[model samples]
Target: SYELTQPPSVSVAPGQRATITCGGHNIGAKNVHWYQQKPGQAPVLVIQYDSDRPSGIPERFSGSNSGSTATLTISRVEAGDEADYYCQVWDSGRGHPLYVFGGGTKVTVLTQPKANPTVTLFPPSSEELQANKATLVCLISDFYPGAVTVAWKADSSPVKAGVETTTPSKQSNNKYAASSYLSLTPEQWKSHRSYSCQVTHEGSTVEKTVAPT
Candidate 1:
């Protein structure tokens, strides 16, 4: 099996340059593609292979490959350029050829103070509770730079199971929104009076608590 590796995070200021490196193991990195994804949005192709840029992409974005490593460079990094980047390559060393994607690199443009996301917790409805099952949703919105962490707690105890979280997606206004779901039975929900949804982003943490009756 082949895998691509990238830096977990990168920070830069507006007008500066940022370079993200991708390395592959057990396969060649001669062919690679670069993609950019803002919070709550699909990944957009920035560069194909070593130098091909898809239509509508800016010239400041470029890619290069050397040996088993590839590099994606962004010149004049701007606030709007803060996003997660990925490197993908095709591997043909095994039973069948497959495309492998690197663990995304998060880019943070540190030009201004980070905008905190509004956190909302929605509890299960009466109908859901009657069915002996419920789902609690935590909605996070209006965040910048896209990187955020979500955690759940029931009666101040950390929840460890039946939790599903979505990747941060971009909103129409260029902000981001993400959702986390917690599944529980009515007995568990009724036993816990306080349920909390917590979000951590950009050095700040916001929490929303609800007591469903």
Candidate 2:
């Protein structure tokens, strides 16, 4: 039971820098804060209150590490600044100590753009089904350097394409590692099906999912 949006809640053009995330329902937060409201202003505290800097502000107003989710970025967006941006935390649960928010990010400051490409998917977890041969294998160890297209879908119907591999790993950190080998069988993996490993680089569309022994 977790519901929170803005983990890239939509972006098309402009100084593209969109990230809005906050999915903590079972509560487990140590610290997180980022707020900005520019449309007459009055809700400013761009990454203050210690996630790090609180002095001169302007590192593009950043915040990081999103795994359990807690990332707020506005790297390049200016001009009336648009407005509405939030991510606040404090609810690790224990009896009750509420304070959480992450549902506000609508900045559309665009023009002269083309540079917002980032994708990473690897060992994302769960995969092991083989028997007959439709095909199945998706490993995107780390990504960068362009060009990627791996598609497959089942239970969601649509599978017929896969094979893209690039392996060169110095233990990763963007050292180069990419893979895609998708072909499903085993009765389409038990029928409880639902397999998808779609990754389209450049225009951006990252994905990974494997369920069915």
Candidate 3:
């Protein structure tokens, strides 16, 4: 069986971008391509044989090349961009290249405070314990070109799916950042469990989990 290895994971703040690198040897790859898969949407080819955008692809989806490395970047990551991304290369056993694929990186969409409405939680503070409704908002104050998922998780369980929104930021000549929110009850937050903010960017998937902290 052909084996393709990818980085374990990667993280980028909401509105901040990251990259995932897929590297391999002896495959004799001549060409590369990129694909994006969302929660409910089928995988779509964002880049073609020569790092060119396919028909109907948005401007945010683009590909670039540096030597034998091919990179696919998503500008201002949205919920729809959260999914697995696979890197493919052509391998020619003797003289021609055959198509081989690297394990895709999984993307987790986050939220943006500017575009997302304020989330009001009852009995604020994680120290306070209660079984009432609460909302958790992702703060993307300094991050730019966001690329991550900012949702509320209970004991590692998802309370509600979330998406990041874009807003202007003051950095690198000012750019757009993304953030979102998650609503849950105090009891849910106190469960000695885990809450995570997952994201996939720069060609890798990353996870940040916390315990009512």
Candidate 4:
């Protein structure tokens, strides 16, 4: 009867703004609220009665319910804001006012300083050549605040298709890694001597180029 949609995760640095939104429509909700659950801790109510802060709740923790959507916004988010946020809703149905909850959104606060990822560009393999295609791999590793955007280029021009980029995953050392691929027809590779993979992190761009041997 009710479904609350939210991002699976959000990662941010200390003193950054963090926003987690829960989505729904025509929920017949009597009220929309939010809760926080840290690891090995009981769920604590954060915002209730359609966005009123519970006693003792910090000013950083404020929420709003715009009927079809609920939002929890963190201002100057700090370490204590790191946890799972759940959106709670209740329907005003006749038989029973059943409580519904979102699947939960994870928030991670990064105290680590930001830096560029070490990038490696790999050429196409023999197996890929046998298929008459060229696949380029761009490996990005050891970055903080796990978020990156990648783009492929043929020479200086953009290549929009045949590309796949992985999301950043935590390394054993708490850094992040992401890899991106660009597939080209071997004919395209033969003709264009320059191919580049450009990775951008927090407005900084790292560009790596490859050429046919």
TM-score of each: 0.60, 0.35, 0.45, 0.59
Best of the candidates, lDDT: 1
Error of 2 at 76 (Å): 4.4
User: Once model 1 is optimally superposed onto the true structure by TM-score, how far is the C-alpha of residue 100 displaced, in angstroms?
Assistant: 1.6
- lDDT per model vs. reference: 0.85, 0.55, 0.55, 0.84
| Runs of candidate 1 exceeding 4 Å displacement | 5-12, 21-31, 36-59, 62-70, 78-84, 103-113, 122-127, 151-177, 187-198, 203-213
Stretches of candidate 4 exceeding 4 Å from the true structure:
1-12, 15-72, 80-108
Least accurate stretch of 10 residues (summed lDDT) in model 3?
Answer: 114-123
In what order do the candidates fall by TM-score, top score first? 1, 4, 3, 2
Best by TM-score: 1
lDDT of 3 by residue, 140-163 (tens): 433423343345556655655533
Residue pairs with clashing backbones, model 1: 39-169, 39-170, 40-168, 40-169, 40-170, 41-170
- lDDT for 42 in candidate 1 is 99
Please estimate how well model 4 matches the true structure, expressed as its whole-model Cα lDDT.
0.84
* TM-score of candidate 3 on Cα atoms, chains taken together: 0.45
Query: Which has the better lDDT: candidate 2, or candidate 4?
Result: 4
Residue-wise lDDT of candidate 1 within 62-154, one digit each (tens)? 888887778899999988998889998877766798888999999988854566899988999888888778999899999876778788899
RMSD of 1: 5.3
